[PDB]
Write an enzyme that holds these catalytic residues in place. Sequence first.
Site, mmCIF file in Angstrom:
data_model
loop_
_atom_site.group_PDB
_atom_site.id
_atom_site.type_symbol
_atom_site.label_atom_id
_atom_site.label_comp_id
_atom_site.label_asym_id
_atom_site.label_seq_id
_atom_site.Cartn_x
_atom_site.Cartn_y
_atom_site.Cartn_z
ATOM 1 N N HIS A 12 -16.031 -13.984 -44.257
ATOM 2 C CA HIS A 12 -16.093 -14.908 -43.130
ATOM 3 C C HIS A 12 -15.187 -14.450 -41.988
ATOM 4 C CE1 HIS A 12 -15.372 -18.743 -40.964
ATOM 5 N NE2 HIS A 12 -14.095 -18.492 -41.174
ATOM 6 N N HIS B 299 -6.347 -15.055 -39.576
ATOM 7 C CA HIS B 299 -6.279 -16.452 -39.171
ATOM 8 C C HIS B 299 -6.350 -17.399 -40.360
ATOM 9 C CE1 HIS B 299 -10.556 -17.054 -39.925
ATOM 10 N NE2 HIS B 299 -10.432 -18.310 -39.538
ATOM 11 N N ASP B 300 -6.350 -16.876 -41.570
ATOM 12 C CA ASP B 300 -6.479 -17.701 -42.743
ATOM 13 C C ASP B 300 -5.675 -17.172 -43.897
ATOM 14 O OD1 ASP B 300 -8.590 -19.854 -43.654
ATOM 15 O OD2 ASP B 300 -8.355 -18.434 -45.312
ATOM 16 N N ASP C 261 -13.949 -18.798 -34.079
ATOM 17 C CA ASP C 261 -13.953 -19.544 -35.330
ATOM 18 C C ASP C 261 -14.890 -20.740 -35.267
ATOM 19 O OD1 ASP C 261 -12.515 -19.932 -38.049
ATOM 20 O OD2 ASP C 261 -12.312 -21.892 -37.083
ATOM 21 N N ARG D 230 14.339 -19.714 -67.664
ATOM 22 C CA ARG D 230 13.050 -19.071 -67.877
ATOM 23 C C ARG D 230 12.016 -19.480 -66.841
ATOM 24 N NH1 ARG D 230 15.793 -19.173 -72.274
ATOM 25 N NH2 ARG D 230 15.575 -17.498 -73.818
HETATM 26 N N1 LIG Z 1 -15.740 -28.682 -48.925
HETATM 27 C C1 LIG Z 1 -15.751 -28.998 -47.630
HETATM 28 N N2 LIG Z 1 -15.682 -28.040 -46.724
HETATM 29 C C2 LIG Z 1 -15.710 -28.511 -45.467
HETATM 30 C C3 LIG Z 1 -15.798 -29.813 -45.080
HETATM 31 N N3 LIG Z 1 -15.805 -29.885 -43.712
HETATM 32 C C4 LIG Z 1 -15.713 -28.655 -43.302
HETATM 33 N N4 LIG Z 1 -15.656 -27.773 -44.330
HETATM 34 C C5 LIG Z 1 -15.529 -26.312 -44.288
HETATM 35 C C6 LIG Z 1 -16.287 -25.662 -43.144
HETATM 36 C C7 LIG Z 1 -15.278 -24.746 -42.457
HETATM 37 O O1 LIG Z 1 -15.774 -23.415 -42.398
HETATM 38 C C8 LIG Z 1 -14.072 -24.775 -43.382
HETATM 39 C C9 LIG Z 1 -12.742 -24.701 -42.681
HETATM 40 O O2 LIG Z 1 -12.739 -25.667 -41.610
HETATM 41 P P1 LIG Z 1 -11.783 -26.920 -41.636
HETATM 42 O O3 LIG Z 1 -12.579 -28.127 -41.171
HETATM 43 O O4 LIG Z 1 -11.146 -27.058 -42.957
HETATM 44 O O5 LIG Z 1 -10.747 -26.628 -40.543
HETATM 45 P P2 LIG Z 1 -10.195 -25.347 -39.787
HETATM 46 O O6 LIG Z 1 -9.156 -24.691 -40.657
HETATM 47 O O7 LIG Z 1 -11.276 -24.489 -39.317
HETATM 48 O O8 LIG Z 1 -9.428 -25.933 -38.659
HETATM 49 P P3 LIG Z 1 -8.142 -25.674 -37.886
HETATM 50 O O9 LIG Z 1 -8.408 -24.808 -36.715
HETATM 51 O O10 LIG Z 1 -7.245 -25.051 -38.881
HETATM 52 O O11 LIG Z 1 -7.634 -27.049 -37.522
HETATM 53 O O12 LIG Z 1 -14.168 -26.022 -44.082
HETATM 54 C C10 LIG Z 1 -15.889 -30.823 -46.064
HETATM 55 O O13 LIG Z 1 -15.977 -32.038 -45.900
HETATM 56 N N5 LIG Z 1 -15.857 -30.324 -47.355
HETATM 57 N N1 LIG Z 2 13.117 -14.494 -78.776
HETATM 58 C C1 LIG Z 2 14.405 -14.241 -79.006
HETATM 59 N N2 LIG Z 2 14.783 -13.807 -80.194
HETATM 60 C C2 LIG Z 2 16.107 -13.590 -80.271
HETATM 61 C C3 LIG Z 2 17.026 -13.773 -79.284
HETATM 62 N N3 LIG Z 2 18.270 -13.436 -79.751
HETATM 63 C C4 LIG Z 2 18.089 -13.074 -80.984
HETATM 64 N N4 LIG Z 2 16.787 -13.143 -81.356
HETATM 65 C C5 LIG Z 2 16.179 -12.843 -82.657
HETATM 66 C C6 LIG Z 2 16.817 -11.668 -83.377
HETATM 67 C C7 LIG Z 2 17.123 -12.172 -84.785
HETATM 68 O O1 LIG Z 2 16.521 -11.326 -85.757
HETATM 69 C C8 LIG Z 2 16.448 -13.532 -84.839
HETATM 70 C C9 LIG Z 2 17.181 -14.563 -85.654
HETATM 71 O O2 LIG Z 2 18.565 -14.562 -85.251
HETATM 72 P P1 LIG Z 2 19.211 -15.801 -84.525
HETATM 73 O O3 LIG Z 2 20.081 -15.283 -83.392
HETATM 74 O O4 LIG Z 2 18.173 -16.769 -84.126
HETATM 75 O O5 LIG Z 2 20.162 -16.401 -85.570
HETATM 76 P P2 LIG Z 2 20.313 -16.361 -87.148
HETATM 77 O O6 LIG Z 2 19.361 -17.362 -87.744
HETATM 78 O O7 LIG Z 2 20.226 -15.001 -87.666
HETATM 79 O O8 LIG Z 2 21.661 -16.946 -87.366
HETATM 80 P P3 LIG Z 2 22.370 -17.867 -88.350
HETATM 81 O O9 LIG Z 2 22.987 -17.080 -89.441
HETATM 82 O O10 LIG Z 2 21.305 -18.777 -88.818
HETATM 83 O O11 LIG Z 2 23.368 -18.626 -87.508
HETATM 84 O O12 LIG Z 2 16.380 -13.971 -83.476
HETATM 85 C C10 LIG Z 2 16.600 -14.221 -78.015
HETATM 86 O O13 LIG Z 2 17.284 -14.436 -77.015
HETATM 87 N N5 LIG Z 2 15.236 -14.441 -77.950
HETATM 88 MG MG LIG Z 3 -12.233 -19.527 -40.095
#
Ligand SMILES: Nc1nc2c(ncn2[C@H]2C[C@H](O)[C@@H](COP(=O)(O)OP(=O)(O)OP(=O)(O)O)O2)c(=O)[nH]1
Ligand SMILES: Nc1nc2c(ncn2[C@H]2C[C@H](O)[C@@H](COP(=O)(O)OP(=O)(O)OP(=O)(O)O)O2)c(=O)[nH]1
Ligand SMILES: [Mg+2]
Lengths: 84, 84, 84, 84, 474, 474
Positions: free
Chosen positions: F62, F110-111, F257, F412
Amino acid sequence: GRLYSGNLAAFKAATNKLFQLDLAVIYDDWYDAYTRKDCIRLRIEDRSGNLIDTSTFYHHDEDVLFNMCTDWLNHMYDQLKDWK
Amino acid sequence: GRLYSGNLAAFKAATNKLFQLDLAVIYDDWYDAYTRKDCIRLRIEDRSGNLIDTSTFYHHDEDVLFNMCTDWLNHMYDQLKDWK
Amino acid sequence: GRLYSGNLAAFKAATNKLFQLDLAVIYDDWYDAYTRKDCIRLRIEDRSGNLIDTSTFYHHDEDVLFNMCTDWLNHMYDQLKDWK
Amino acid sequence: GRLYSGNLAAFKAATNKLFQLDLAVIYDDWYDAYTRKDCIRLRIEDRSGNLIDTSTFYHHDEDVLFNMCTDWLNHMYDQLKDWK
Amino acid sequence: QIDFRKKINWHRRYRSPQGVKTEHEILRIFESDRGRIINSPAIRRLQQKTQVFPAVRTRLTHSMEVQQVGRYIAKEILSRLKELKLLEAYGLDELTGPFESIVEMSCLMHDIGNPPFGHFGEAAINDWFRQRLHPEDAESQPLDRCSVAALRLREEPLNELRRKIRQDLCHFEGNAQGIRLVHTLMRMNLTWAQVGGILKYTRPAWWRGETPETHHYLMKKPGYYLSEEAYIARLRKELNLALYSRFPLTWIMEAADDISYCVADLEDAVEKRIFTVEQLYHHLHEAWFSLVVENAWESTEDQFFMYLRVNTLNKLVPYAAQRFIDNLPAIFAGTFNHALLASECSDLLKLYKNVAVKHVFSHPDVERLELQGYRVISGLLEIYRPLLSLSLSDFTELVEKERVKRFPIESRLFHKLSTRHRLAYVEAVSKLPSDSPEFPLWEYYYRCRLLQDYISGMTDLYAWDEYRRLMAVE
Amino acid sequence: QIDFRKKINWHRRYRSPQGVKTEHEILRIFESDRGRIINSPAIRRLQQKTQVFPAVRTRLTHSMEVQQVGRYIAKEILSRLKELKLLEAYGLDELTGPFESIVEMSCLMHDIGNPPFGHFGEAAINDWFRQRLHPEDAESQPLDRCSVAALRLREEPLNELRRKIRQDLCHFEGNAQGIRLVHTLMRMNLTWAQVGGILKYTRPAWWRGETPETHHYLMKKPGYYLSEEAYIARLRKELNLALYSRFPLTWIMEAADDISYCVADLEDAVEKRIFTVEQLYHHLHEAWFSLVVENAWESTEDQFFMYLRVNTLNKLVPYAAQRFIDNLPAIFAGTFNHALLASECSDLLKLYKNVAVKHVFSHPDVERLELQGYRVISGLLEIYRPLLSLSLSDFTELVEKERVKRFPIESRLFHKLSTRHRLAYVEAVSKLPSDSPEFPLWEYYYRCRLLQDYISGMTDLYAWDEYRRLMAVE
Ligand SMILES: Nc1nc2c(ncn2[C@H]2C[C@H](O)[C@@H](COP(=O)(O)OP(=O)(O)OP(=O)(O)O)O2)c(=O)[nH]1
Ligand SMILES: Nc1nc2c(ncn2[C@H]2C[C@H](O)[C@@H](COP(=O)(O)OP(=O)(O)OP(=O)(O)O)O2)c(=O)[nH]1
Ligand SMILES: [Mg+2]
Ligand SMILES: Nc1nc2c(ncn2[C@H]2C[C@H](O)[C@@H](COP(=O)(O)OP(=O)(O)OP(=O)(O)O)O2)c(=O)[nH]1
Ligand SMILES: Nc1nc2c(ncn2[C@H]2C[C@H](O)[C@@H](COP(=O)(O)OP(=O)(O)OP(=O)(O)O)O2)c(=O)[nH]1
Ligand SMILES: [Mg+2]
């Protein structure tokens, strides 16, 4: 071409803000015959059913139209909190 | 309302049997105007393009029509193996 | 940049064609030191292990190299079918 | 070899318990140069940023180290609830 | 005398514009060609075809980079001719605009004819047919393993057509299929100059024997099929080309493809958890090297290739422009027998090619998808085998009536072919003389072409899904 | 006095080229921008984002059509000024080349800022935050439902920053995110003129209240975030723009557009077994109409749109060019308060829009994918909620040490964020004065921005897969 979420959120917030003061807002929308623009009519009334004010806005762009509706609602809110 | 597989197999077997004697069979099918029945025309020809025989069969049921086509083909086959 | 399948098919066909006349073909490929081109050596021998002919071709494009190998093999085939 | 969840829960509980008395605890951890043991430093301060107390603990086992940290925190908590 | 006005032809095949035009009208004519090509289903389909790995590059994004490289080369060549005041003697004074557009659009649609699964999909089509016709047995006096009765050698005038048809059907090529796709099936109706830029090789697909020594590079792969022997003659008449000659601008599109060959693959590998930049750095260093790759080292992955590409472009593009300008008469005659890229600039490309071959194109995941595609294409070619065993009268009745009570299985296989392919077959057959002994041969040839077009017009995913569905597995 | 030399700026932000240049050097500068943009991961990612239907068009195809429309409009405008000999008074004598390139590259990117799932993905980000900060409660004297202790109103100087941060975080927009993507995260280092062409609206995202009556069209949507209040001031200083003004060329990209809005959707529907051409013909006829759509009727689907597009282009592009030329002083000043497209040319577009709304955008399959995307984005925003509940010291220790024995779950979650986002956060934080009472506020703002960038930088498929994987379903 669609309506951005922020404008709708502002509209709803204004309606709730001025409804929590014992008011009510009624809404209607339509399309104009030859002016080629959308039309929105708002009416602010009280609990007793008495009509306090009306207004009508014309525009062919949704965002501008809703911004005008929101700022008009805010003006009505603060001019009804000027007194009473 | 469809055509049973055995009748089609018999038709194909007859065509192959009498084609393996240096002949050829050409087929055409259509629908009749007012008789309200399907129409099948068969023509048996030789390799040199000479037309040996023609026949036409009319019926509104597919199975009966194909049985008539098959037994006519068998009659032509054995009357062409009566001599030559 | 790869080798097209048709050229490989032609090469294999030529080898089989001239092998079905009680011959054998041995192949080797390498890369040149400074000439910047691939190198192919072919040797045509007999069943008794005697070497009949050798040839070597140099080129930096795979398709051209294999075309030269194939047409050389065809030339050897028909000049060995000129006599014996 | 890892740290058991209960010790960590006790540490967090002690910190929250003595923080809900308008205090604050800052933590830092590192590894020692030649003592071959982990090192934890804790500092207890007030809201106004004034440092009230500091302590440092050395040990090569995580569970023992965290138990010492927790019981030291509890001792500080109840000696600050002895007065003020 | 070099004159580019006799090469840039803006006429068409149907409803061609006639008369005398100006610069604005010519530019408008050539912009409509871009409009047609960009909004075509063939270009859209390219975003579902795999380049190397199944934010990895498809065939569309790679073409969008070849297009930029070709445009830059064309602008450099045009700039270098103004510094020597040769844009008026060579006729390019009022044709600079179309010069870039032709090159760019030729670069974009340089890969629209390749079958699904790529190189391993092309062999499967070729092998399956080679066991059906055995072209190698038609190279001499009549002997025969051909499985079709109407093509076995027995009558020299028919024998020549027999051997031509038997040889042509076993040489399938993407470049030869592109012309058929843009002319007969899609019916885009492009200008002659635009079609001439996608004709890379000039060997007929029916050619048997040894190529002339003066064209051993332009003859290394098939160029067009037997069904276009009449369309290419008119193309040569319009663009003023001799037999076995190439269009000039095609040399640029060939170079831009060679520069963007193994630089993107490396980035795909480095973002697919294969190896690290450090490892890549070490592989390249131990590969050989100038001041082109070292300077790009000093995120990190996002801004290493981002400067290596610029470094290689700034040292490779001017060499291509100089090679184009130096060998201008031979290129203009169409008989130049080399490529624009035995110099130090050609070693840097071999470096990337060797690294990619050694460390990327040998990963286990790439090789398995090459064995699976072979199997899928070979299997799909065997399901539609019944359509190739019918007689001429049976197939004619099937294509005419479209509801046959004698062939319940074949009538349903025929309805899965796309509509445009069936119209192509009908139009091709309706132009032959019925009262002629060569009718069955041409009918069989066109039927095989129809099957090949249907197989090669798919995507890698649609073919895989259809293969699983038609075998009652999914 | 109109002078385009003061608007086409070829300087950069880092390592900008200085001195006096010629035409060739300027063209070389602007070609490198194309080279950078085309080979960027952001453009490549666009081939996995859904436009309407999940040979259907993605966002990349587009954009490749909007680019062609914009290029054609720019060339038409440039041609119309040569027939009036105004290319020397307006300064465009030696800058015709970059004029098309800026428009084309602005049309392409533009998108690039839109979140996964489109419009329904943008609301989910906005709603989830509105329940966390409640901006509506910070519009007056201090009262409070804010869930963050460091942002509740209690101290006017800190109150102003509090309300600004609370308002800004609940206004997420794709156009405002594009600037952040090209400047801070990706670090493309483009010219000022190229960046100015992707700034469509000029309302600050922290703006509260009523807009001036002279800019009620340029203020209808947020334009930029609070983190770029310093980058936009320099942009206005370089390109000679007043407060609340727009770049001229942006008007063209906006028109291109609008022309390519609802013509492609209809083709997608007609090739997705929804309705037939005949039905489409009937829907359009009963819609109103000139001689633009009738003439295209007389395969079939492949060559009906293929002429309707040409018919609509040949009647819409010149009108846009005339509107651009007529209103030139106001556009050049940047204060024009309308769009280029109350005439008969504006009714034809409304026709397509109405047909698409009535018969395409109401199909059951389109609406379900809009309820699923809302759910997926809302769910993904809730998994990473723990990262937003930590303290400043805890998050600092987590980002520094990267191996914490006190937070096993949060450590994590933090490692799944992309590397470039974390570097952006580190660089943003390292520029603030530590000995200041406003440090926690800025730290929280940048943390929320980091989360928003990570959520919005995905594809529709990757987010869906991650949502299923993190909930122990797959
Ligand atoms: N699914 C869906 N698509 C729609 C609807 N109305 C418009 N579109 C589609 C057609 C356009 O190619 C596309 C993007 O246009 P929009 O209306 O979302 O706004 P646009 O980003 O072009 O406007 P802008 O300049 O950013 O304010 O959305 C709707 O009700 N449902
Ligand atoms: N996924 C993972 N495994 C780990 C990590 N650190 C150690 N391990 C693995 C290696 C060991 O073979 C296994 C079991 O050891 P643990 O540290 O959980 O404790 P363990 O049960 O041997 O100790 P304990 O005597 O029961 O206090 O866990 C970790 O950060 N992530
Ligand atoms: Mg567009
Ligand atoms: N899928 C399919 N179903 C068909 C077709 N023609 C008819 N049918 C359906 C409609 C009937 O309700 C159903 C069973 O009728 P059939 O024509 O198979 O024969 P039926 O068993 O009624 O005949 P019978 O009295 O046994 O000779 O088959 C066809 O071409 N395809
Ligand atoms: N999987 C795989 N890809 C390869 C191999 N060698 C090259 N490629 C990739 C890199 C190229 O971008 C891509 C297409 O190049 P090819 O070598 O297939 O030939 P190309 O069509 O460019 O040549 P042409 O001008 O048509 O003769 O194939 C290989 O051994 N395996
Ligand atoms: Mg390529």
